[PDB]
Design a protein around this ligand. Structure first.
Ligand SMILES: OC[C@H]1O[C@@H](O[C@H]2[C@H](O)[C@@H](O)[C@H](O[C@H]3[C@H](O)[C@@H](O)[C@H](O[C@H]4[C@H](O)[C@@H](O)[C@@H](O)O[C@@H]4CO)O[C@@H]3CO)O[C@@H]2CO)[C@H](O)[C@@H](O)[C@@H]1O
Ligand SMILES: OC[C@H]1O[C@@H](O[C@H]2[C@H](O)[C@@H](O)[C@H](O[C@H]3[C@H](O)[C@@H](O)[C@H](O)O[C@@H]3CO)O[C@@H]2CO)[C@H](O)[C@@H](O)[C@@H]1O
Ligand SMILES: [Ca+2]
Ligand SMILES: [Ca+2]
Length: 428
């Protein structure tokens, strides 16, 4: 196996996502915005396996891999295709927008193994695909929910199903020599606090050391999947910087969390895991699909330096942060911008920036009363209410954009905002 599957390979371009991008560009009046959309359609995004039907629907998992072979032949270079394994029972257990089809109380773990992992592994095992690099992102949100959300019965009752299902997926996937495995580990605005950070290091160390290959069972971890947290807060580089007598991490936006950005968080986690016995060959991914924070939204434009207002930590931090969400827990349908393009080894210890969440796809429907045919357990979550308050701190609005369809469906109003707000800006 390679030390980094993203080195020396070009990213798979998902034609089914690109078709949505190009179709929206063809309906966009502004010719520069439309040309920016056409350029976005050329970048590489992950393919989500978000239900049993996704294995065969449309071109299906086999179709994407065949298309990857096609792109590899056309380019004369290896292709790296990213897959998201996303169907654990009691999925999305701390929210409502992405609850899945399998339930722990309805033989969900058994169905997960037999109807989801086993057919995926059979397909990835085909020797026709040996020349691809196949990256599997394992079950976003599941393990982070075990760190912070055990007070929710849907999470606590699922915890051993998560552990066993994830070990089962990784143990089977590790029998395939061109499959590179990354565990999801949330983002700095979720697990950055000392207690969450240490709980996560403990949890993931136990999960991996119980795998068949122990610490050799995975190739690393990914942060920021489907979230918006910046790679870097360049104007808040020191969480202990004293402003008006207080460290800036004490600001309301951070609540003493010393990790303001994903580079600090990902590299600190990598070092922590190496200290627990993981080999130094592990690498980190960061999802940069929607964390650029160009443009303007939520009453601010991107800061161009540290704030001139040093009269209080809150004023200073709020004027200096590029993450301009009202509250750091606002995960649904945010008016952010596309971030750095997918790219290999941008920083030591970082295997790649990737677009795992595909820009333009919804995080959740924005009002109740609407049922989706293809995901009958997807429901309205108040975090997606454009007129509501955050359910993590009701003093703040959700920031969610209106007119959003159910999670995963094309959200043209947000896609236009994400392209306009891209950082670095899209060049036609
Ligand atoms: O297979 C052809 C089929 O595709 C359908 O669209 C898929 C789309 O291909 C896929 O990327 C997407 O995956 C979603 C997932 O459903 C959704 O639950 C997840 O939501 C996130 C969300 O963004 C978070 O904020 C929060 O809600 O938690 C989850 C987990 O992070 O996001 C991914 C990526 O968007 O699902 C689509 C719907 O199945 C077409 O709709 C269909 O017509 C095609 O036949
Ligand atoms: O990242 C996308 C996923 O987000 C999930 O929500 C989590 C938020 O992303 C995260 O910011 C929030 O963090 C909490 C933290 O867990 C808690 O200890 C602290 O006190 O407050 C933070 C928020 O201020 O946690 C939530 C989960 O509870 C969504 O549930 C998921 O659908 C989405 O993909
Ligand atoms: Ca490696
Ligand atoms: Ca930093």
């Amino acid at each position: 196996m390679l030390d980094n599957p993203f080195i020396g390979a070009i990213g798979y371009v998902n034609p089914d996502w690109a078709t949505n991008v190009i179709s929206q560009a063809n309906q966009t009046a502004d010719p520069t915005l439309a040309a920016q959309m056409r350029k976005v359609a050329t970048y590489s995004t992950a393919v989500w396996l978000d239900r049993i039907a996704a294995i065969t629907a449309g071109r299906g998992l086999r179709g994407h891999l065949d298309e990857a072979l096609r792109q590899m032949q056309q380019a004369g270079q290896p292709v790296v295709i990213t897959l998201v394994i996303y169907d654990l029972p009691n999925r999305d257990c701390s929210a409502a927008a992405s609850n899945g089809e399998l339930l722990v109380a309805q033989n969900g773990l058994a169905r997960y193994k037999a109807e989801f992992i086993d057919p995926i592994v059979a397909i990835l095992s085909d020797p026709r695909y040996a020349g691809l690099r196949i990256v599997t992102i394992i079950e976003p949100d599941s393990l982070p929910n075990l760190v912070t959300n055990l007070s929710i019965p849907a999470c606590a009752e699922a915890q051993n199903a998560y552990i066993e299902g994830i070990r089962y997926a990784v143990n089977r996937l590790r029998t395939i020599p061109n499959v590179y495995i990354y565990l999801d580990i949330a983002h700095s605005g979720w697990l950055g606090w000392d207690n969450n950070f240490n709980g996560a290091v403990n949890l993931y160390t136990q999960v991996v050391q119980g795998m068949d290959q122990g610490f050799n069972s995975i190739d690393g971890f990914i942060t920021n999947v489907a979230n918006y947290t910046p790679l870097e807060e360049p104007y808040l580089p020191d969480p202990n910087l004293t402003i008006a007598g207080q460290p800036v991490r004490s600001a309301s936006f951070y609540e003493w969390n010393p990790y303001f950005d994903e580079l600090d968080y990902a590299l600190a986690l990598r070092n922590a895991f190496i200290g627990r016995g993981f080999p130094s060959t592990i690498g980190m991914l960061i999802d940069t699909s929607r964390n650029g924070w160009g443009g303007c939204s939520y009453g601010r434009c991107r800061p161009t330096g540290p704030s001139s207002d040093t009269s209080s930590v809150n004023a200073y931090v709020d004027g200096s942060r590029v993450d301009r969400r009202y509250h750091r827990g606002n995960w649904c349908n945010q008016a952010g911008g596309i971030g750095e393009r997918p790219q290999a080894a941008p920083r030591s210890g970082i295997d790649a920036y990737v677009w795992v969440k595909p820009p333009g796809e919804s995080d959740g429907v924005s009002q109740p009363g609407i049922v989706d045919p293809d995901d009958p357990n997807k429901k309205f979550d108040p975090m997606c209410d454009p007129n509501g308050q955050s359910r993590y701190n009701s003093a703040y609005p959700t920031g969610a954009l209106p007119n959003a369809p159910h999670a995963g469906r094309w959200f043209p109003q947000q896609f236009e905002i994400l392209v306009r707000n891209a950082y670095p800006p899209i060049q036609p």
